[PDB]
Ligand binder design. Structure first.
Ligand code: I35
Length: 127
C-alpha cells in the first residue's frame, strides 16, 4: 500500500520579487522500499522538471510520465494552480507504478529527504 498526495499549494516569500508556489508531497506506505513510512516535503514545479529529466537519464527505454506543462489560456491563478496540482499528483502516481523508476535513489531523496536538488545531484556525481 502506497498513498501519495500532492496537496496544499502555498506562495513562498509572498509579496516579493522571488515569490513562487510549492506543493506538499504526502507519502504514506507499508512498503520498506522507502526509508520512512510517513513523509511530508515541499517541492516547487522546477524541481519536478529536474526529477523527470534525471529519471529519463537513468531509466533507458522505460517511459517517464509527462508533467502537466504550461497553459495557453488565462484563467484565475487559483484554477491554474489546481490543474497543475492534479498534474503533479498524476505524474507521481504513474512514477510509483514502475519497479524500475521506484528503484531510483534520486526519486527517494526527492520524495523523502529535505536535500535541495543540487545536493541530490552532488550525492550521485560524488559516488
Ligand atoms: C534548479 C535550477 C532551475 C533554474 O533556475 O531553471 C529554471 C528555469 C525556469 O524557466 P522555464 O523554462 O520557463 O520554466 C519555468 C519554471 O519551471 C517555473 O517553476 P517554479 O519557479 O514555479 O518552480 C514554472 O512555474 C514555470 O511555469 P509557467 O511558465 O508559469 O507555466 C516554468 O515555465 O528553466 C528550467 O529549469 C527549465 C524548465 C522547463
Amino acid at each position: 500500500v502506497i498513498t501519495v498526495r500532492v496537496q496544499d499549494p502555498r506562495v513562498q516569500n509572498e509579496g516579493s520579487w522571488n515569490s513562487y508556489v510549492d506543493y506538499k508531497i504526502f507519502l504514506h506506505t507499508n512498503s520498506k522500499a522507502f526509508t520512512a513510512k510517513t513523509s511530508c516535503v515541499r517541492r516547487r514545479y522546477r524541481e519536478f522538471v529536474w526529477l523527470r529529466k534525471q529519471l529519463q537519464r537513468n531509466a533507458g527505454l522505460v517511459p517517464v510520465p509527462e508533467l502537466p506543462g504550461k497553459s495557453t489560456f488565462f484563467g484565475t491563478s487559483d484554477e491554474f494552480i489546481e490543474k497543475r496540482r492534479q498534474g503533479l499528483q498524476h505524474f507521481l502516481e504513474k512514477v510509483l507504478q514502475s519497479v524500475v523508476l521506484l528503484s531510483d535513489s534520486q526519486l527517494h531523496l526527492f520524495l523523502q529527504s529535505q536535500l535541495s536538488v543540487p545536493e541530490i545531484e552532488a550525492c550521485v556525481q560524488g559516488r
